[PDB]
Structure formats: structure tokens, C-alpha cells
């Protein structure tokens, strides 16, 4: 499943690190996952930003916050 | 990418719904991406609370209410 992909990027991720800094990794992993979750959605709901709303759970302003950053829309 | 993987999770998943009402899915995608996450920063810290949130670029606070929401601590 999912979280195990999660696990294996992180171990990946922090061998990459070879002892140096990151302050930035929430930020990072979400992008990651929070940008094709955004795109799968509004695939499955034929651009309707309510109806993604709706099946995800935020209310429509979120949806286009988010969607915003991720220059979505 | 990590990126790649969350697309196939949801497709897979749209593809199980038929007359399921998803209402829950962008904390339920969080939830399998953030569990992971704090495991393996807690992992790479081991569990030195302040180097994770600083890692992470999250406040030590939002951290622990992130470990205690999750049941993890």
C-alpha cells in the first residue's frame, strides 16, 4: 500500500541526506502527495470543484486555496 | 516519483467506489502519508521531539498534537 511507499521514499530520502539539513520536510511530502490527490480528484469529478470538495471533505475554499498553490487553478 | 504512486493509490481506489460516498478522502489520504512520515522522522531522531519538528519545519507543538492524534507519542 500507500504508507509503505511513504516509508521507502523517507529512507531513500534520508540516506540522500549524508549528514546536512533539511527544516522542510512536511512541506515536501505533502506536495508530493497532496498535488496528484488534487489532480486525481478533480479528474474523477469532470472539474467539479464542489463535487471535490464534497467527496474529499473540505469545503470549496479550500479546495481552491490549495489548488491555487499547486497552480492549479 | 513519490508523486506517481499516491496517482496509482487513487485510481485503484476510485475504481473500487460504484455507489460509495467518499466524504472523508483527503484526511483519510493524509492520514496513510503522515503516520509514515512521523514514524520514520521519530526513527531518524530517535525520538529527539525538537530535531523532528525542526526537520520537518513544523512548531515542537504541532508536532506532539500531530504524535497524539495519530495514537504515536
Same mark, same amino acid.
Given at each position: &500500500? =500507500?504508507? %509503505?511507499? /511513504?516509508? @521507502?521514499?523517507?529512507?531513500?530520502?534520508?540516506?540522500?541526506?549524508?549528514?546536512?539539513?533539511?527544516?522542510?520536510?512536511?512541506?515536501?511530502?505533502?506536495?508530493?502527495?497532496?498535488? &496528484? =490527490?488534487? %489532480?486525481? /480528484?478533480? @479528474?474523477?469529478?469532470?472539474?467539479?470543484?464542489?463535487?471535490?470538495?464534497?467527496?474529499?471533505?473540505?469545503?470549496?475554499?479550500?479546495?481552491?486555496?490549495?489548488?491555487?498553490?499547486?497552480?492549479?487553478?
Amino acid at each position: &500500500p =500507500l504508507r %509503505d511507499s /511513504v516509508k @521507502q521514499a523517507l529512507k531513500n530520502y534520508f540516506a540522500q541526506l549524508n549528514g546536512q539539513d533539511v527544516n522542510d520536510l512536511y512541506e515536501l511530502v505533502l506536495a508530493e502527495v497532496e498535488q &496528484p =490527490l488534487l %489532480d486525481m /480528484v478533480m @479528474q474523477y469529478t469532470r472539474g467539479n470543484q464542489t463535487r471535490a470538495a464534497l467527496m474529499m471533505g473540505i469545503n470549496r475554499g479550500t479546495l481552491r486555496k490549495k489548488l491555487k498553490k499547486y497552480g492549479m487553478n
